[PDB]
Each structure stands twice: as structure tokens, then as C-alpha cells.
Design an enzyme around this catalytic site. Structure first.
Site, short mmCIF file in Angstrom:
data_model
loop_
_atom_site.label_atom_id
_atom_site.label_comp_id
_atom_site.label_asym_id
_atom_site.label_seq_id
_atom_site.Cartn_x
_atom_site.Cartn_y
_atom_site.Cartn_z
N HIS B 97 46.49 -42.89 -11.36
CA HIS B 97 47.10 -44.13 -10.87
C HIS B 97 46.07 -45.01 -10.25
O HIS B 97 46.40 -46.17 -9.63
CB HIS B 97 48.15 -43.52 -9.58
CG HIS B 97 49.45 -44.57 -9.81
ND1 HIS B 97 50.59 -44.08 -9.24
CD2 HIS B 97 49.57 -45.88 -10.27
CE1 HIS B 97 51.37 -45.14 -9.28
NE2 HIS B 97 50.87 -46.27 -9.85
N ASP B 120 57.40 -43.42 -7.36
CA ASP B 120 56.42 -42.51 -7.10
C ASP B 120 56.92 -41.56 -6.12
O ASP B 120 57.78 -41.70 -5.21
CB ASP B 120 55.16 -43.10 -6.36
CG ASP B 120 53.93 -42.39 -6.82
OD1 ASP B 120 53.85 -41.21 -6.72
OD2 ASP B 120 52.78 -43.24 -7.29
N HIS B 122 54.75 -40.41 -4.19
CA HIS B 122 53.82 -40.67 -3.19
C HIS B 122 53.64 -42.04 -2.92
O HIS B 122 54.01 -42.80 -3.86
CB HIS B 122 52.40 -40.10 -3.79
CG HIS B 122 52.52 -38.66 -4.20
ND1 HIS B 122 52.82 -38.17 -5.47
CD2 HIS B 122 52.32 -37.63 -3.53
CE1 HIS B 122 52.74 -36.81 -5.74
NE2 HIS B 122 52.56 -36.45 -4.29
N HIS B 137 43.38 -41.99 -6.79
CA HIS B 137 44.41 -42.35 -7.15
C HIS B 137 45.46 -42.03 -6.16
O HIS B 137 46.84 -42.32 -6.34
CB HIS B 137 44.69 -41.15 -8.19
CG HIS B 137 45.39 -39.98 -8.05
ND1 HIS B 137 45.97 -38.96 -8.60
CD2 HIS B 137 44.60 -39.17 -6.74
CE1 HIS B 137 46.04 -37.89 -8.20
NE2 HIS B 137 45.20 -37.95 -7.04
N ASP B 228 54.85 -43.90 -11.71
CA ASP B 228 53.93 -42.62 -11.72
C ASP B 228 54.92 -41.54 -12.25
O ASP B 228 56.18 -41.49 -11.51
CB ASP B 228 53.76 -42.30 -9.94
CG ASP B 228 52.80 -41.17 -9.90
OD1 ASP B 228 52.85 -40.13 -11.09
OD2 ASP B 228 52.18 -40.97 -9.13
N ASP B 230 55.43 -38.83 -11.87
CA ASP B 230 55.71 -37.68 -10.77
C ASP B 230 56.82 -38.14 -9.93
O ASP B 230 57.11 -37.35 -9.03
CB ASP B 230 54.27 -37.04 -10.02
CG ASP B 230 53.78 -37.92 -8.92
OD1 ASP B 230 54.48 -38.80 -8.45
OD2 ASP B 230 52.73 -37.80 -8.81
N1 LIG Z 1 48.31 -38.18 -0.74
C1 LIG Z 1 47.71 -37.57 -1.75
C2 LIG Z 1 48.52 -38.20 -3.07
C3 LIG Z 1 48.00 -37.64 -4.44
C4 LIG Z 1 48.91 -38.17 -5.59
C5 LIG Z 1 48.42 -39.49 -6.04
B1 LIG Z 1 49.52 -40.03 -7.10
O1 LIG Z 1 50.83 -40.38 -6.47
O2 LIG Z 1 48.98 -41.12 -7.99
O3 LIG Z 1 49.77 -38.99 -8.12
C6 LIG Z 1 48.00 -35.90 -1.65
C7 LIG Z 1 47.58 -35.59 -0.31
N2 LIG Z 1 47.75 -34.31 -0.18
C8 LIG Z 1 49.17 -33.79 -0.26
C9 LIG Z 1 49.31 -32.52 -0.16
C10 LIG Z 1 48.87 -31.87 1.27
C11 LIG Z 1 47.36 -32.39 1.27
C12 LIG Z 1 47.16 -33.64 1.15
C13 LIG Z 1 46.30 -38.01 -1.79
O4 LIG Z 1 45.35 -37.19 -2.38
O5 LIG Z 1 45.93 -38.95 -1.23
MN LIG Z 2 50.71 -42.54 -8.02
MN LIG Z 3 52.39 -39.71 -7.48
#
Ligand SMILES: N[C@](CCCC[B-](O)(O)O)(CCN1CCCCC1)C(=O)O
Ligand SMILES: [Mn+2]
Ligand SMILES: [Mn+2]
Ligand SMILES: N[C@](CCCC[B-](O)(O)O)(CCN1CCCCC1)C(=O)O
Ligand SMILES: N[C@](CCCC[B-](O)(O)O)(CCN1CCCCC1)C(=O)O
Ligand SMILES: [Mn+2]
Ligand SMILES: [Mn+2]
Ligand SMILES: [Mn+2]
Ligand SMILES: [Mn+2]
Lengths: 306, 306, 306
Positions: B97, B120, B122, B137, B228, B230
Site C-alpha cells: 500500500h 481497508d 487499517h 505501507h 486494500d 485486506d
Molecule cells: N498499523 C500497521 C498497519 C500495517 C498494514 C498496512 B496496510 O493496510 O497497507 O496493509 C500495523 C501496526 N501493528 C498492528 C498490530 C499490532 C502491532 C502494530 C502499521 O504497520 O503501521
Molecule cells: Mn492498506
Molecule cells: Mn490493510
């Protein structure tokens, strides 16, 4: 309350082997005990043996097994007519959906003001001039609707059919794979349907409310429920010939059947297109048959509250 | 109606191998034929090869591959801007992403009054000062929103970005895994979102109505859909790097895409985070890619009623 | 906020081996860390050891382990009562649902105006005179409701029990497998319930709104949430003794728990009927336990928006 059960092992409305074993599969899943438990008095007609037709060549180089489908349906219509005339609500187990030509025709003989609730991923309303498959299971509604008859050619073996009902007397629920000429037909003849998108928007409660307002809002009519198992999501009903992703949930299917029962007007039911040979496992085949039994039992009064 | 398709095999916005193979997987699932069938005139830009950056050391001992992600996005933005300027609705296949930094920047380069629907699990709105993973991402939105810039440090490779898009011009749908600083950001800047809980309450129909009232209720604007994979429940989209239970159903995803199409304003779309290597089986990989194709096709007009 | 966690490895309220391992399974799934992360101060009572009763013969030749269930519940009630009076919100991990006799009795000892939200596929309201199984886990509610006491015989080991709840103070959510005499009881005593069919009609948001209007619409009361994991669809919670198809979705279950948390009134929670031995794979066992943890964490404040 009396229920007739007719096995109709139709397979010649389509090209995939195995759907003729649907009735056995549904019986094996405990149908008759489930109906008995609800208080239904049963007459089992068994699985019918339909008269074959020799040299049943393609019609117009495309339409498959027309004489066979036509004769089997003529024979089925006679059995359904007799059962309804004797006071039974008529359950017909398929078999492919071409059998609805016979069940609805037979039903309409004594109950000409019947209405139809057609639960299916597909509209099954191609005509012999619009079908791209040639398969009669994707055409049965075209032979039954009075408004369409100037657009439907006469197939060999079909001369006995006279269109039974008006386009205002059928409502579809569950549609998510419709050919372009079918979409044209639905719009041009103002045929009412609730597609999966309409269910997403309205919710199944409002869908049933509106279905009944359209069909029986101002007068009571015997209901013909023609239920293609492929209305359900393929995760729930994998053993079927034309699965389409994004279907009814289990709960939605039960709700439809419950509302059908709650009208008090169910007069005939088709449960079609269970093909156990298309399951990748025994579990897949049995879950599909179990689901078929749940639909039929719910349509005749099984509740989720005791 | 013209559609450009750009493969952007980004993987350096995160740490899991394989997401660079997302574009090929989506193509092999039949994307181009599906779009052509809808009447889209296609320009395929192929899969881009991005310029590597030597010695792309961590930023602040945390943020991984900053110059590589920065430059790949700068290069991507040039291609997206050219496609949009030439009159194409621009579909970008990911890839992780972080590529939305490039696609949204490139889109805005031609269409400065665009708005964004971000679908998403997230929020992807961490900044380099709030991220706990260091993965770009999970930060792309912080680089794009004008109101956040006094809180976003300058990363190497990122100086070319011109973030003008207002926090009032993005709406999220699908949120269910949001980091505490992201929650603070969403609330502090009054950024509108419909979490899975909001969808549970309102239903997807009302969610879409409210989304469009927020973004295009006062004036017509080109829409950027950043999707996304997901956002979907992991049972439907298992081949992805950060699955979170309790996601969109298949029907909800199709409904979102249908409503995007129905605005007539879709100008660019990202379909990101398909990682075929994370599937347990070929079937899981293929179903994820097939789902991606369904989202894209629905966003450009494929219906469930024919 | 302080939370007591009590393991109650009850199995003698039913006949299937393994449910006594539910508490360990739920802990192994990370319960304590999840609660700590929300800010809960924890007192872990471990898994209780209940006093066996020698020669605990069938009552009336039908009712299974009556003295054992009665004594274990008396012991459990003392622990719950002490914990609640010390100021803890009480989480009891099962174990079969017969344990609710003990938890609700103990809870009511210091909180006489408590109300009960019973989330379950089943009504658990058979009496020793209506049960067809003889299993006490399908009877707990009959021993607790004041209005039913003239129809509930005195079981050996049950003399310590005084009904402490009015029929107007319990609401069911999730019902789909109800025995005919339970249906009679629910109707005759005007006990309020939202079956799966009611959820299909109203949506979970409206179900929770109506539930709270019924119970706490006029005054604040401590809430006892008794949650049978079999309320969820068996695809989500397969490791349980009496699975019934067509249950709550993951999202619906989270929504229920979120709304319980949002009242601010949760005082005790039971999470019962996780039986890891009935899983056909370790994955099935683990997902059921993970789901149990999600319900408990959501009931104490875990959100889906950060
Ligand atoms: N908030 C996350 C999101 C990762 C997914 C990105 B996407 O939507 O493009 O796929 C994950 C942060 N993380 C979540 C679980 C507990 C520890 C922190 C991050 O790495 O910042
Ligand atoms: Mn994303
Ligand atoms: Mn995501
Ligand atoms: N419209 C179909 C329907 C077949 C299903 C019949 B039913 O509902 O009884 O099971 C299929 C047409 N086909 C759809 C895929 C693309 C080519 C055309 C047809 O063969 O006419
Ligand atoms: N009503 C049952 C319920 C058992 C589940 C208990 B719970 O919810 O704690 O898990 C089942 C009775 N049985 C149902 C199938 C048909 C015969 C009767 C009973 O044994 O009383
Ligand atoms: Mn069909
Ligand atoms: Mn059909
Ligand atoms: Mn239960
Ligand atoms: Mn129970």
C-alpha cells in the site's frame, strides 16, 4: 395437512451428469422424517421414470434434448396435477430446473391463479431465441409467461404447454447471474425481482414483505415456490452445476422459507439442481442435501424458536 | 471510456516477501478480459521496473527502505499523471500500500480536487514519528494530507511530494485494526471513517450514501478508490500480509464497488496487498486474485443483475 | 477496574468428555494479556477443584450427576460472591453451562437487582420434569427464575438454591434450538428473547437497543452476561458440544460484547461450553478459544477502531 413428494430425476435440461441423483440425495438426508415430525401426512410417489424419446436431435442446432424435456414435463405435469387435485401440497425434488415447466403447468391446471416465488442465482428466462447455452434449465420461465409467447418459438415436444401465468405473477429472489437478453426481458415486461444487491440494500425481511405485497397483497393465491439450490452461496451449496459466488446465507434461506410457510398458502415446492456428483467430497454432497432438506422443512413450518 | 492498467510490484513498503507478485496474479485471474467485456478501452502499461537506490539505510533506525519507496513512488506518480492526463481512469495493481503515495500524488497532479475512498482494515495513517513497525505501507496517508504536515518529518526520497489533499476529502471504509496514535489522528483532524462496527450498525447501503454525501455532496469531484484487499475477511482474501478477522463480506465489497461505479466519477483505483506467496494453497492464492478482479470489474460497471 | 478470572472446569452438567479443558484452552489463547492490555487489574483464581460426590446416582433415573453439579455450583457461588463483594467484575471460564447456576447465584447474593443477558443457541430452561436429555447444562435457567419455582422439583444437592431472578430480568439473544416445553415456558412466562430470526429481521444494533430498554430502560442495574460459545455459528466455534447451524457471525458477537461494555454496567461474565476435544483439528480448537478471548476482551472494552 398432506404433502406429496415426487422425485423427478431430470438431467436433460442441462449437460452435466449427476443431477438425476438429487432426489435420492435429498431423501437420504432425512426429508421424509423431517416432514413427518412437523405433522405432515405424506404420500411418496417415489422417483418417476420418464419416457425417453428416440433420436431427440438438437432443435435449431442448439437446443438440447427438446422432445425428452418436453415429454418428461408433460408426464410430470400429470402427476403434479393429480396430487394437487387430491389436496396435497406438492414437493418435487430435482433434477434440473427444466422440471419447473412441468410442475408449474400441472399446478396451474387446478390452481390457475397461482403465483410463483422463484429463488435462484439465475432468472431462467432465456427463450429458444436468446439462450447461448441451448440448455432448457435456463429457459423454463419463458414457456410459462403469457406475455412472452409471441417471442417463444414452438419446440418439438412442447405443443402441450400453454403459458400459465402473467409476468406480474412471478417474483425472483437471489439473482446474481443474468444474461443480457434476460435483463432485457425482465425490464421490458416489468417483471419484479430482488437481486442479491437488493437484498444487500433492503434486508431479507423487507424483500419478503415486498414480494408478498406484489403477489398476494390484495388477494390470496396458492404459492408455487421454485427453489434452485444455487440461490445459496457456493460455500453452503457446492454440489450444483452452475454455482455463482455471493449468494444467500443460510439464515437468509431459512427466512425466505419461514415467510413462505407463514403465508399459509404454499401449494407446491420445487427443490432443484442438487447434483451430488459435483461435490469434491462426500461432506460437500451431504451438506448440500442437508441444506435442501432444511429449506423444505422450513417451508412447511420448521421454526428456529421451538 | 478508457482504462489504463499499471502493474506496480512494490514490496519495500513492508517486510513480507511475495507481494511484488500481486500484479501478475491479478492479471492471470483474467482482469483485462473482464474490463474489455464491460466496454473499457484498455492501455496496458505492463509491470513497471523501479529504479533502485544504493545504500538505502533505515531512517531514524526504524523506517525501512525510505529512499527506495520514495523514488519508486516518484516514478509511479509520473506514469499515473501521464495516464490520467491522457484521459484514462487509472488502475494500479500492487504491490504493497505504500504505492498509494505515488498513485494519489500522480492522480492529484492532473486532478487537484480529487477525493479518496480508502477501503481497508487499517487506517494507514501513522507518521514516521508514530509508526511502531517502520513499514511505509502503514503510513501512506500521513504523507498526503495537508493538515498533518507539521507533524510529518521529511524523509530522504520524499521531498518531491506536494500534499494538498484535505483531511475532509478522504473517507475510510472497513476499519478494524487501528493503532492508538492513528485513532488520535483520526479524531484530532476530524477524519471521517466507517469502521466495521459502523457497517454492522448502518448497513453498507447507508455507509455508501453517507460516504458520498461527505465527499461529493456539494460538488462533483474525481474519485480515487484505494482498495486494500485486506478490507475483506481473511476467509475470502487469505493471500495478504496483514489479515484481520471480521472483515467485509463478498457482497459488501461488491456493493462498495458498485456504488463507486454508480457515481460516474471514478478516476483512479488501487488494488493493493495481494500476496500470492502467503496463501497456504494454490486455491487460496487464486481466490484472492479472483476477488481482486471482481472488485476492479465491479468498480467499472460489472453488475449482479445483468 | 478490577477483574477476577475464575476457571470452573465443569463437565458433569452434560455427557461429552473434554469441556473441563475449556478454561485452560481460553487461557492458552492469551486471555490474561488481552485483559491486562485494556487496563484491567487482574486476580487469577486459577482453575477451581470441586468436591466430588460419591455414588452420585441418576435422579429419577434420568437427571445426570445432580449432587455433583449441585455441590460444585454451591462452591462456585461462594467464590463468585466473595469476588464480587471484594469489588471484582467476575469472569468465569467454563466448563459446561450448568455452572451459571453457581455464578448467577453468587452474583445475586450481593447484587440482588442484577439482570441477565443470556447469549446462546439454546434457552437452557428445561426443568427436571421437561428435559429429554437429563443434562443439567440444558436446565440452569429453570433453577434461577422466581416465577418457575412451583414447577421445579427439589434435586439432591440443590437445596441451597433460592431463585433470585424474575422472568422479566433475563433476555436471550441467539436462540435457534429450543425444545417444545421450553418454548411453552418462554411464552407462558413472557420471557423476552431475540432468536436468530429476530436478529435477521431487526439487525444486531436494534436487538441490543431493545435488550437494554427491557432490562435497564428505567434504572441502572448490574449486568450478568452468560455467553455460551455455541451462540456462534459452528463454522466459527466448532469446538463445542451442541453446535447448531445458522448462528451469530463473528461481527454480531463482537457487537453484542461491545454494547455490553458500553453500558458501563458489566458485573460478571460467563464464557462457557468451549470443548477443545471436540475439535477435529488443533486449528479448530484454537480458533474456538481465540473467539472466546475476543468475546471477553470486547466485553471489557476492546474496540475495533483503536
Ligand atoms: N498499523 C500497521 C498497519 C500495517 C498494514 C498496512 B496496510 O493496510 O497497507 O496493509 C500495523 C501496526 N501493528 C498492528 C498490530 C499490532 C502491532 C502494530 C502499521 O504497520 O503501521
Ligand atoms: Mn492498506
Ligand atoms: Mn490493510
Ligand atoms: N443463463 C444460463 C443459466 C444456467 C443456469 C440454470 B438454472 O438456474 O436452473 O441452474 C447460463 C448462461 N451463461 C452464463 C455464463 C456466461 C455464458 C452464459 C443459461 O444457460 O441460460
Ligand atoms: N435443550 C437441550 C440443550 C442442550 C444445550 C445446553 B447448552 O446451551 O448449555 O449448551 C437439547 C435437547 N435436545 C435437542 C435435540 C433434540 C432432542 C432434545 C437439552 O439437553 O435440554
Ligand atoms: Mn440457478
Ligand atoms: Mn434455476
Ligand atoms: Mn447452547
Ligand atoms: Mn447454554
Amino acid at each position: 395437512h398432506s404433502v406429496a413428494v415426487i422425485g423427478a430425476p431430470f438431467s436433460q435440461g442441462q449437460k452435466r451428469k449427476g443431477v438425476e441423483h438429487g432426489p435420492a440425495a435429498i431423501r437420504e438426508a432425512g426429508l421424509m422424517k423431517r416432514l413427518s415430525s412437523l405433522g405432515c401426512h405424506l404420500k411418496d410417489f417415489g422417483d418417476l421414470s420418464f419416457t425417453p424419446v428416440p433420436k431427440d436431435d438438437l432443435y435449431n442446432n442448439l437446443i438440447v434434448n427438446p422432445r425428452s424435456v418436453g415429454l418428461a414435463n408433460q408426464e410430470l405435469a400429470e402427476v403434479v396435477s393429480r396430487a394437487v387435485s387430491d389436496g396435497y401440497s406438492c414437493v418435487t425434488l430435482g433434477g434440473d430446473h427444466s422440471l419447473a415447466i412441468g410442475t408449474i403447468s400441472g399446478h396451474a391446471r387446478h390452481c390457475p391463479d397461482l403465483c410463483v416465488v422463484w429463488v435462484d442465482a439465475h432468472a431462467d428466462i432465456n427463450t429458444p431465441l436468446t439462450t447461448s447455452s441451448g440448455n432448457l434449465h435456463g429457459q423454463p420461465v419463458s414457456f410459462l409467461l403469457r406475455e412472452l409467447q409471441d417471442k417463444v418459438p414452438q419446440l418439438p415436444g412442447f405443443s402441450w404447454i400453454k403459458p400459465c401465468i402473467s409476468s406480474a405473477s412471478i417474483v425472483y429472489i437471489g439473482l446474481r447471474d443474468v444474461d443480457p437478453p434476460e435483463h432485457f426481458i425482465l425490464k421490458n415486461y416489468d417483471i419484479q425481482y430482488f437481486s442479491m444487491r437488493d437484498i444487500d440494500r433492503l434486508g431479507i425481511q423487507k424483500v419478503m414483505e415486498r414480494t408478498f405485497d406484489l403477489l398476494i397483497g390484495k388477494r390470496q393465491r396458492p404459492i408455487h415456490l421454485s427453489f434452485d439450490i444455487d440461490a445459496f452461496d457456493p460455500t453452503l451449496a457446492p454440489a450444483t452445476g452452475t454455482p455463482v459466488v455471493g449468494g444467500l446465507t443460510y439464515r437468509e434461506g431459512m427466512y425466505i422459507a419461514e415467510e413462505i410457510h407463514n403465508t399459509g398458502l404454499l401449494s407446491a415446492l420445487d427443490l432443484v439442481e442438487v447434483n451430488p456428483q459435483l461435490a469434491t467430497s462426500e461432506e460437500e454432497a451431504k451438506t448440500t442435501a442437508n441444506l435442501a432438506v432444511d429449506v423444505i422443512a422450513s417451508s412447511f413450518g420448521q421454526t428456529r424458536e421451538g
